[PDB]
């Protein structure tokens, strides 16, 4: 056979390298200010998400990363279990 293709998958997201890093650091990473423009602060938010997306899975263009995430995010039950777990933690 030819070599099988490599893809983004929920296992990467649920890995310790994955989504927990964002929740462990996002409060410290991003910072808005009224003292800078909308365009300024708006640009700032995307920085962290871009660098994190590269570190996670360098295949593809940033937009493609988001739009790929939509499919697995809506379909996989284990990922959804993790997400309802987050919002239960806030219900705790």
């Amino acid at each position: 056979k030819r070599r099988p293709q490599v893809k983004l998958t929920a296992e990467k997201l649920l890995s310790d390298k994955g989504l927990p890093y964002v929740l462990k650091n996002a409060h410290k990473r991003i910072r808005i200010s009224s003292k800078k423009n909308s365009y300024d602060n708006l640009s700032n938010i995307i920085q962290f998400y871009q660098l994190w997306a590269h570190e996670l899975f360098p295949k593809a263009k940033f937009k493609d990363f988001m739009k790929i995430c939509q499919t697995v995010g809506k379909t996989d039950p284990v990922l959804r279990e993790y997400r309802v777990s987050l919002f239960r933690d806030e219900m705790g």
Partner: protein, 143 residues
Amino acid sequence: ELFPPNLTRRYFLYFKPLSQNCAAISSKPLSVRQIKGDFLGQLITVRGIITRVSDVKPAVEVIAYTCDQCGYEVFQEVNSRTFTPLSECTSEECSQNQTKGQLFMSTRASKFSAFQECKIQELSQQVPVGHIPRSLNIHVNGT
């Protein structure tokens, strides 16, 4: 090995022949006619007059490249008079991330050495009657 050892040799090395007063062929001078095909590979001594000298130019020994997408560097070693430069990042990590990145050459981390070429010719008072004088090509590197 991570990189070729030639890339970090900061020095040059040369042999100096036997003193004839201690003496072996390397101590005994040959005229440019006596250098037969038997001597290929050996260390010898030659006596004559220099006819022309080239000016110095650089020659590559180890070439260095950068991969754009995965931010990784690779090296190539050159021995022959010509070479083909690399154009694909064959690194295993880069390959397993299916990252078909582009390679670009860099001078700032390549290794060069100084090169010069000359020619030597037999003394006119040693040419046998009715013949035309012969000559040899000399190469020089390093200090």
